[PDB]
DNA sequence: GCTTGTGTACACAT
DNA sequence: CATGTGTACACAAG
């Protein structure tokens, strides 16, 4: 997985987007604090579908 | 879900990602493109359990 | 005194 | 009437 800085995500936030469009998965990370993925909302949507039909408790 | 555009989540992505950590789901909005989703890390690598359909 | 984060603002493009 | 995208400045935090 990609993996980018916080000044470096934002200096470069379209070019994140187009990776992320492009079925990419980047991690936003920050100093000390707890890091991010940016994900196409279709995909992570399409996961949180998939994961509700598991017959779980 | 909290939805905002590209504009302002490049002008207040400090902010977006604090929300983020405290456990919200943010889309990203940009025009004629498909919307993203900033998430948790912790979130997201549970979620992809999911892949537990493709098994 | 670096690096990196955060606020912000300007200019051009769509 | 706005939003996307490059970029750059300055101050804060570590």
Redesign the interface.
Known sequence: MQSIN?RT??GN??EV?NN??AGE?V??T?RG??????????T??A?????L??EFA
């Open positions: 916080f995500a934002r936030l379209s987007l992320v469009e998965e991690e936003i920050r604090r707890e890091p991010a993925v940016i994900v196409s909302k279709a992570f949507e996961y949180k579908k998939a994961a039909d598991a």
